[PDB]
Amino acid sequence: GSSGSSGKPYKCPQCSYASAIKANLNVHLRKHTGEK
Ligand SMILES: [Zn+2]
Numbered sequence: 001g002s003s004g005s006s007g008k009p010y011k012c013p014q015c016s017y018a019s020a021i022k023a024n025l026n027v028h029l030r031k032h033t034g035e036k
Helices: 022-029
Strands: none
Touching: none
């Protein structure tokens, strides 16, 4: 196996999380911008 990285541009500023869609990162950040 010789594969590189995922190439996913939209990455979390707090996690190792990445996605191919800006709105998927937007939903992920709603958990970082507030709670309870
Ligand atoms: Zn995150």
